[PDB]
């Protein structure tokens, strides 16, 4: 399929979300003169949206993180497809379908490791919404897969792959799929594997 990357935000902790719970991530484009704010309301390191080309235009299907020569996203988002940035092809290099992970241009570079009790920020890239840092306390949960980290934030469908950041600005994982845990909690998994 026709899959495009659109850079949305820096991978950094947002102080305002600590104070407030939430904070928009506003980026300024310098233009050929005027400053303006990026407004996704309207339709290389960083967070990106993954858009499919429709007849009606581009629709966001997920999100991911560029770091250390490598794009990182969810298997179920791209399902192994080649991605496009500005006419360049980026081809998948590594996947773990059971972890729901896929990297492009290299092996897994993400190195954050969430510690139980500590707060994190989801740098959420909801379709048609500006980025928002959302500060949250994830939990340890039990699943038929085993033990997962997970957060009790339910974003809109195509936010999956948004990075989850500790206070050092490390990516502790990606905003994964909805699961009902042992216990009956409906939660989103922190999708992560080890740096290779």
Give the catalytic positions in this structure.
76, 100, 160
Q: Whole-angstrom Cα distance, residue 194 to residue 140?
A: 18
Q: Whole-angstrom Cα distance, residue 129 to residue 109?
A: 27
Q: 124 with 131: CB under 8 angstroms? A: yes
- Whole-angstrom CA distances from 59 to 11, 28, 123, 126 are 22, 22, 19, 11
Burial class (CB in 10 A: 0-12, 13-18, 19+), 37: exposed
Cβ neighbours around 29 below 10 Å, total? 9
Q: Whole-angstrom Cα distance, residue 196 to residue 111?
A: 10
């Amino acid at each position: 399929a026709d899959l495009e990357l659109e850079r949305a935000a820096d991978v950094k902790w947002e102080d305002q979300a600590e104070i407030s719970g939430s904070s928009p991530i506003l980026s300024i484009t310098i233009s050929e003169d005027g400053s303006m704010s990026i407004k996704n309301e309207e339709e290389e390191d960083g967070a990106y949206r993954i858009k499919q080309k429709g007849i009606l235009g581009y629709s966001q299907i997920g999100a991911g993180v560029y770091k250390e020569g490598t794009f990182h996203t969810m298997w179920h988002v791209t399902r192994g497809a080649v991605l496009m940035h500005k006419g360049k092809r980026i081809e998948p290099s590594w996947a773990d379908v059971k972890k729901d992970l896929i990297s492009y241009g290299g092996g897994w570079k993400l190195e954050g490791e969430w510690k139980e009790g500590e707060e994190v920020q989801v740098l959420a890239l909801e379709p048609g919404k500006n980025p928002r840092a959302v500060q949250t306390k994830p939990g340890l949960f039990q699943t038929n897969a085993g033990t997962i980290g997970a957060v009790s934030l339910d974003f809109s469908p195509g936010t999956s792959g948004s990075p989850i950041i500790d206070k050092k600005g490390k990516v502790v994982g990606l905003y994964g799929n909805g699961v009902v845990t042992r216990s009956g909690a409906y939660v989103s998994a922190i999708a992560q594997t080890e740096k290779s």
